[PDB]
């Protein structure tokens, strides 16, 4: 039938002015474009087939050709930006938006998917899809009393497409579009399907990746407790974006950070900071570093949840990128913490792993650590214990790392480092 047609034969069938011949040829094109390996997208574009496919989207009396052309165009739009542009340039956006109202679920679903690929290209096409009025009919498809009545594949495609409308920066999505989408997104974030939850979390992570005003729009919707819950999911594809969203939120105000703490996030961190997935440990440690950049009462919560030993652990042994986040977490802690909090940090064993990292060939982490040490010495001065600290550092071999850093190429490193030796070691 329609298996392995040449593009030439597809063109012949499409040019026939016989709707059924055109349907067979469009199906043949769909099969080429859906094959496992190397779909001939550029060949199909070069043959001038896009305008015909777009015209077929409007064939209400022939729902099969609407479906086949929708699938063909979805796959062309799944390619490079130039390939996606060819689909947009053919007038596909409003044609697909019209198909959202199709009585045929499999057709409206394909239109949802195609619009997701187009919006996924970047901010410009995202915003163009929004200008053509895609949001109202997309949200209308989810306006049911219980999401569980929808087919799960259908619901997953809608959630994914909505997440692409929330994605990308420079610019971020229109504020009014975000407000319009948020209530449905919150509902999806409470739906019990792992893929819907993952893509909902991804969407929330995009919406919180920005200025405090953007974070506030999300936090105000009361989603933090649900994010904290999903943070404890067993599925890594859910934990990953849930953690990114939580991490994003704590880059915000002290008050936004406090919502995360109030929701119980810190109790999940012993497991996150020891997670066998390197990326999870790194993101969790980055998150901790922004929490220890917070108020003294928020640092105290980190202490009370027993998280300081976990930071000592990550500093002692982790992927180097994670160790650098831990170094940051410590410098922030020592910068904002009380004397008592800083004393507690040393008692937990921070000094030796801090000193061991001074042999890293990374200027930034060296600067960060020297800052922490300086901060810890300033606390020692207030207790008159600079000598005890001076001894701890010498004993673990930290002093002849600091001494050697006096000859380092970077100005801050050699400078801070010189300062430390005269000041506490001379």
């Amino acid at each position: 039938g329609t298996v392995n047609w040449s593009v030439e034969d597809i063109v012949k069938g499409i040019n026939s002015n016989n709707l059924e011949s055109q349907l067979q040829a469009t199906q043949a094109a769909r099969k080429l474009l859906s094959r496992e390996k190397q779909p001939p997208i550029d060949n199909i574009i070069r043959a001038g087939l896009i305008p015909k496919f777009v015209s077929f989207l409007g064939k209400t009396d022939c729902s099969p050709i609407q479906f086949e052309s929708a699938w063909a165009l979805t796959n062309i739009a799944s390619g490079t930006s130039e390939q996606t542009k060819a689909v947009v340039d053919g007038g596909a956006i409003p044609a697909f938006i019209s198909l959202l109202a199709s009585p045929h679920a499999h057709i409206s679903e394909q239109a949802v998917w195609a619009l997701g690929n187009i919006a996924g290209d970047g901010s410009a096409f995202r915003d163009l899809v929004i200008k053509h009025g895609a949001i109202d009919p997309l949200l209308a498809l989810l306006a049911v009393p219980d999401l569980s009545t929808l087919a799960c594949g259908y619901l997953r495609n809608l959630t994914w497409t909505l997440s692409n409308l929330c994605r990308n920066k420079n610019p971020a999505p229109p504020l009014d579009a975000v407000e319009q989408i948020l209530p449905t997104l919150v509902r999806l974030l409470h739906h019990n399907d792992p893929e819907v939850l993952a893509d909902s979390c991804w969407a929330i992570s995009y919406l919180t990746d920005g200025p405090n005003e953007r974070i506030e729009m999300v936090v105000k919707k009361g989603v933090v407790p649900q994010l904290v819950k999903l943070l404890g999911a067993t599925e890594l594809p859910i934990v990953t974006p849930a953690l990114r969203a939580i991490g994003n939120i704590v880059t915000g105000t002290d008050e936004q950070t406090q919502k995360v703490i109030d929701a119980g996030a810190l109790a999940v961190f012993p497991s996150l900071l020891t997670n066998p997935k390197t990326n999870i440990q790194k993101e969790a440690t980055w998150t901790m570093s922004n929490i220890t950049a917070g108020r003294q009462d928020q640092i105290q919560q980190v202490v009370n949840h027993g998280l300081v030993p976990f930071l000592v652990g990550v500093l002692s042994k982790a992927d180097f990128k994670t160790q650098k986040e831990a170094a940051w977490a410590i410098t922030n802690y020592t910068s904002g913490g009380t004397v008592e909090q800083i004393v507690y940090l040393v008692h937990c064993g921070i000094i030796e792993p801090l000193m061991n990292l001074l042999s890293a060939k990374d200027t930034k982490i060296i600067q960060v650590i020297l800052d922490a040490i300086s901060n810890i010495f300033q606390a020692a001065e207030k207790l008159g214990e600079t000598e005890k600290l001076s001894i701890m550092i010498e004993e673990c071999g930290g002093l002849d790392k600091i001494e050697a850093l006096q000859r380092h190429e970077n100005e801050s490193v050699y400078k801070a480092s010189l300062n430390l030796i005269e000041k506490y070691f001379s």
Binding site: S34, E36, T74, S163, D199, D209, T240, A293
Partner: peptide
């Protein structure tokens, strides 16, 4: 302040 800035596919092809 001292706060610091910092796998879903962007596009999907329908196969089979």
């Amino acid at each position: 302040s001292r706060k610091r800035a910092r796998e879903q596919p962007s596009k999907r092809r329908r196969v089979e």
